[PDB]
Symmetry: C5
C-alpha cells in the first residue's frame, strides 16, 4: 500500500481548520477538518486511529505533521482513504476517511503523489 | 469506550488557563484548568494519569494536545469523564474528572462530538 | 507518593531563570534554578535524574514542562522533595532537591497542591 | 557507513521548500524538496523511509531536523545517497535519493562533510 | 562519570552557531559548533553519537537541549570530553569532542559545574 495509490483520494489547496484528539476502543485518535484556502467547496474530514487500519504505523508521524500544518495554516494537499472507519456515531461526527498523507502546496504545485 | 459517549461530559468555548504536571503512585500525571473564553461561569478542572483509568492509552496525545492549546490560548471544547479519580487530597486539589478529549472551536461550532 | 504530599516543599510565584542538562552515573539529568518574580528570597535549585529516585517515571514530563515554563518566563509553583541526591560534588554545584512537580500561577493562586 | 562517505552526494546552500509525509509498505516516510538559495540550478528531492535502507535508524532525527529547517527557511547542505528507492511510481513522484544528513550553513561554509 | 568531572572541559559564554545531523555505523548522531558570544576566540565543535561512548544515554536529551539553545541564540556553557571519537574522516570534519552537557549563562555566571 502507498499514500499515492490511485485507490486513495486527495484534495489540494486546503487549509487545516480544526483539530480534535480523543480515544476510541482503546485507541488514541485524531481528526482534522480542512477547507479550501480560497473558501470554495465542501470541508474534508479525515481521522487517524492508533493501532487501527493498515495506516496505523504512520499515526504519530501524521499527528505531528497535522499539528505542524495546523499551526502554520499553510495550503496543503490532504490524502485519504475512503470508507475505513465503521463505528457509526464516530463516522457521523467525523467521517469514515482514514488520513493517509499530507503534502505542502507552496510553489507551483503540491509536493506529493498526483 | 469513546470520547463522544453521552455518559461523558463536555464544555464548549473554553480556554485552557492553567497547567500542572506531577506524579502520583509511580504515574506521571497532568491537570488542566479551563474557563469560558468570555470569562463567565465556573472553571473546569480535569486530569490524566499515565497508567490509570480506561483513558490511559491517550495520556501522551492528550498531554501534547493540552500543551499546544494552552500555548495558543484558542477556544476549545473539553471532554471529561466525571468521578474517575479517588485519591482524596488529589480530588480536593484538582477534581475527579478524567480528561478524555480536546476539540478546537470556531465562533459557530466545535469540531468534536456533542 | 504524590507531588502534593505534605512532606514535600513548594515555592510559589517563581520564574525558572536557568536550565542545565547533563549526565551522572549513566543517567541523563536536568536542573533548574528559580527566583521569586518580585526578587525577594533566595533562589531555589532542583534536579530530576533519569531512572533515579521514586520520581524517575516523571523525568521526561517535568523536563518538557520545565523547558516550556523556562521559555515563557511565566510565574510557577515549584514542588520539590528535599535531601534526595547524595552525590557530594553534584549537590554542591546544584542541590539535593528532587523536582517533583510544576504548576502555573495566576494573580491570586497557583494551580497545584499546597 | 557514514553520512560523509564520498559515495554519497551533497548540495550546499539549499532551502527546504516542500515537505510531504505518508506511508508505504507499512512504513511511515517523508520527502523534502530543496532549491538553491539564489534560485539557480534545479531542485533536489530526497526521502527517508522509517523501515527501509541502512539509514532507517536516523529517520526520526532527520524528520525533526527537516521540519525545523523547513520552518526557518535557512540555507542548508542536504546529504543524500542516490539510487536507493525502487518503487517506480514513488521514484517518479519524488526521487530515488535517500536522505542521509542535514547541515546548517554559515555565511561562507556549511557545517558538515564535503 | 559526571558532566562536571574536572577531567572534562567546558567553555563559557558561547552561542551554538551551527548544527548537523547524520548517521554513522548504524547510529544517529549530531554535532554542534559554538562561538564566543562576544566574537573572540576559537570555535568549539562537539558531537554526540546515539549508540557510542559512555555518554550515549543522554543523546536525546542533549539533542533536544542543543536544538533549544540553537533556536534561541542565548549564551551557554558547553561541556565536552576530549579525544572520544576516533574515525579519522569524522574527526577531521568535526572533532573528537563528545558533548556531555549544556548550561544556560547569565551575564555574571553559568548555571553548571565549573
Ligand atoms: C480530477 C477531477 O476529478 N476533475 C478535474 C479537475 O480536478 C481539474 O481542474 C483542476 O482541479 C484541481 C484540483 O484537482 C484535484 C485536487 O484537489 O488536487 C484532483 C483530485 O484528484 C480531486 N479529488 C477527488 C476525490 O476527486 C480534487 C477534488 O475534485 C477537489 O479538490 C474538490 O474540491 O481536485 C485544481 O483545482 C485546479 O486549479 C483545477 O484546474 C481539470 C483538469 O485540469 O479537469 C477536471 O475534470
Ligand atoms: C564537472 C564538475 O565537477 N563541476 C564542479 C563545479 O561546477 C563546482 O563549482 C563550485 O560548486 C560549489 C558547490 O560545491 C558543491 C556543493 O554544493 O557543495 C559540491 C558538491 O559535491 C556538488 N554535489 C554533487 C556533484 O552531487 C554540488 C553540485 O555539483 C553543484 O555545485 C550545486 O548544484 O556543488 C560552489 O557553488 C562554488 O561556488 C562553485 O565554484 C564544484 C562542485 O563540485 O567543483 C566542480 O567539481
Ligand atoms: C591560556 C589560558 O588558559 N588562559 C586562561 C584564561 O583564558 C582564563 O581567563 C578567564 O577565562 C574565563 C573563562 O574561563 C573558562 C571558561 O570558558 O569558563 C574556563 C575553562 O576551564 C576554560 N576551558 C578549557 C581551558 O578547556 C575556558 C577556555 O579557556 C576559554 O573559554 C577559551 O576561550 O575558559 C573568562 O573568559 C574570563 O574573562 C577570563 O578572565 C583563566 C582561567 O582559565 O586564566 C588562564 O588560565
Amino acid at each position: 500500500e502507498w499514500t499515492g495509490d490511485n485507490t486513495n483520494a486527495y484534495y489540494s489547496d486546503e487549509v487545516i481548520s480544526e483539530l480534535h484528539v480523543g480515544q476510541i476502543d482503546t485507541s488514541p485518535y485524531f481528526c482534522i477538518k480542512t477547507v479550501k484556502a480560497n473558501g470554495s467547496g465542501t470541508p474534508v474530514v479525515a481521522c487517524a486511529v492508533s493501532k487501527q487500519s493498515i495506516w496505523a504505523p504512520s499515526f504519530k508521524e501524521l499527528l505531528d505533521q497535522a499539528r505542524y500544518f495546523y499551526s502554520t495554516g499553510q495550503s496543503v494537499r490532504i490524502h485519504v482513504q475512503k470508507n475505513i472507519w465503521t463505528y457509526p456515531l464516530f463516522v457521523n461526527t467525523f467521517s469514515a476517511n482514514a488520513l493517509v498523507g499530507l503534502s505542502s502546496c507552496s510553489a507551483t504545485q503540491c509536493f506529493g503523489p498526483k
